[PDB]
Scaffold this motif. Structure first.
Motif, PDB file in Angstrom:
ATOM      1  N   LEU A  51       4.954  -6.931   7.712  1.00  0.00           N
ATOM      2  CA  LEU A  51       4.347  -5.620   7.879  1.00  0.00           C
ATOM      3  C   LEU A  51       3.231  -5.721   8.907  1.00  0.00           C
ATOM      4  O   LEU A  51       2.921  -4.774   9.614  1.00  0.00           O
ATOM      5  CB  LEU A  51       3.777  -5.140   6.537  1.00  0.00           C
ATOM      6  N   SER A  52       2.611  -6.887   8.973  1.00  0.00           N
ATOM      7  CA  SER A  52       1.485  -7.076   9.865  1.00  0.00           C
ATOM      8  C   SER A  52       2.011  -7.152  11.293  1.00  0.00           C
ATOM      9  O   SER A  52       1.453  -6.559  12.217  1.00  0.00           O
ATOM     10  CB  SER A  52       0.753  -8.360   9.494  1.00  0.00           C
ATOM     11  N   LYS A  54       4.817  -5.853  12.428  1.00  0.00           N
ATOM     12  CA  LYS A  54       5.318  -4.553  12.801  1.00  0.00           C
ATOM     13  C   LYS A  54       4.216  -3.590  13.230  1.00  0.00           C
ATOM     14  O   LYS A  54       4.401  -2.838  14.196  1.00  0.00           O
ATOM     15  CB  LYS A  54       6.157  -3.975  11.661  1.00  0.00           C
ATOM     16  N   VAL A  55       3.076  -3.602  12.537  1.00  0.00           N
ATOM     17  CA  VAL A  55       1.952  -2.753  12.960  1.00  0.00           C
ATOM     18  C   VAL A  55       1.265  -3.217  14.247  1.00  0.00           C
ATOM     19  O   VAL A  55       0.589  -2.431  14.890  1.00  0.00           O
ATOM     20  CB  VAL A  55       0.852  -2.568  11.892  1.00  0.00           C
TER      21      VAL A  55
ATOM     22  N   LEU B  52      -4.279  -3.063   6.645  1.00  0.00           N
ATOM     23  CA  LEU B  52      -3.017  -2.510   7.125  1.00  0.00           C
ATOM     24  C   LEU B  52      -2.844  -1.039   6.775  1.00  0.00           C
ATOM     25  O   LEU B  52      -2.296  -0.291   7.568  1.00  0.00           O
ATOM     26  CB  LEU B  52      -1.829  -3.299   6.584  1.00  0.00           C
ATOM     27  N   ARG B  55      -5.227   0.729   9.369  1.00  0.00           N
ATOM     28  CA  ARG B  55      -4.554   0.661  10.661  1.00  0.00           C
ATOM     29  C   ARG B  55      -3.397   1.631  10.760  1.00  0.00           C
ATOM     30  O   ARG B  55      -3.175   2.242  11.817  1.00  0.00           O
ATOM     31  CB  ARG B  55      -4.010  -0.737  10.914  1.00  0.00           C
TER      32      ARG B  55
ATOM     33  N   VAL D  55       5.771   2.518   7.638  1.00  0.00           N
ATOM     34  CA  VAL D  55       6.002   1.843   8.911  1.00  0.00           C
ATOM     35  C   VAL D  55       7.399   2.154   9.455  1.00  0.00           C
ATOM     36  O   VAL D  55       7.558   2.368  10.657  1.00  0.00           O
ATOM     37  CB  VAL D  55       5.704   0.321   8.833  1.00  0.00           C
ATOM     38  N   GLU D  59       8.272   3.909  13.142  1.00  0.00           N
ATOM     39  CA  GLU D  59       9.217   3.296  14.061  1.00  0.00           C
ATOM     40  C   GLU D  59      10.348   4.250  14.487  1.00  0.00           C
ATOM     41  O   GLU D  59      10.689   4.315  15.670  1.00  0.00           O
ATOM     42  CB  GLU D  59       9.785   2.030  13.426  1.00  0.00           C
TER      43      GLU D  59
END
Ligand SMILES: [Zn+2]
Lengths: 63, 63, 75, 63
Positions: A51-52, A54-55, B52, B55, D55, D59
């Motif tokens: 997830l990190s 991807k962000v 996250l 962010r 997320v 995307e």
């Protein structure tokens, strides 16, 4: 006095066997659990890393 | 003299029991450490999570 | 009476710390502690093993290095 | 002989009882902090799923 003291003893150590036998199960089981806790955690961390990743990509794709 | 022979029998078994319990004691401890470690890394992990989320909320709002 | 595995385990009270494998699977694999370092011994075939690396399998190493062991054949 | 054997064993016996007492207590504390470790995981696993869900939506929003 002493005859009854001895009888108390062979009774006590008799019971000591099943105590140990149970503890052995319980300790194995608990070890097991803790292990499965560690494992589960490691999978989460891996999910966080992902997830990190991807962000960071989105942030670079945007701003 | 056979009651002194009983008592001998008991003393020896008791030694085995106390040694097994020593080992079990050690097992439980390794579990505790593996565990306390997993639990610690997962506090830093909840920090990365909240970072996250923030962010990510940011990204939601510049879209 | 207690299992032969447990009696084998009880030999591990004086086992060193830092060793990557549990005294439990070491005993289940048929080995008792020799009292020296991290060295164990099969009661049965007499295979002795030491220096245990992270993630070793005590059982597999017993089947491989001495397939002839009467014990290692029942396990 | 038998008197001192029994007196001695009554000590080693009480010794054993003490060890086992403490071992049991620690198994319980390990069992409890594993229950808690796994309660926290349940709470973060749901936060992760929520992130991974947000997320993906993003995307898709941009390719
Ligand atoms: Zn063997």
């Amino acid at each position: 006095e002493l005859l009854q003291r001895c009888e108390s003893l062979e009774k006590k150590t008799a019971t000591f066997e099943n105590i140990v036998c149970v503890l052995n199960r319980e300790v194995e089981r608990v070890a097991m659990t803790a292990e499965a806790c560690s494992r589960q955690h490691r999978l989460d961390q891996d999910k966080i890393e992902a997830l990190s990743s991807k962000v960071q990509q989105l942030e670079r794709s945007i701003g | 003299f056979m009651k002194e022979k009983l008592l001998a029998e008991l003393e020896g078994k008791l030694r085995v029991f106390e040694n097994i319990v020593a080992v079990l004691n050690k097992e439980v401890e390794a579990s505790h450490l593996a565990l306390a470690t997993s639990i610690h890394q997962s506090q830093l992990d909840r920090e990365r999570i909240l970072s996250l989320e923030q962010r990510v909320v940011e990204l939601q709002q510049t879209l | 009476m207690l299992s032969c595995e447990l009696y084998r385990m009880s030999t591990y009270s004086t086992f060193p710390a830092g060793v990557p494998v549990s005294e439990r699977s070491l005993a289940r694999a048929g080995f008792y502690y020799t009292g020296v370092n991290d060295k164990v011994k099969c009661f049965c075939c007499g295979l002795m093993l030491d220096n245990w690396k992270r993630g070793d399998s005590p059982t597999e190493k017993h089947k491989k290095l001495y397939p002839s062991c009467r014990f290692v054949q029942s396990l």
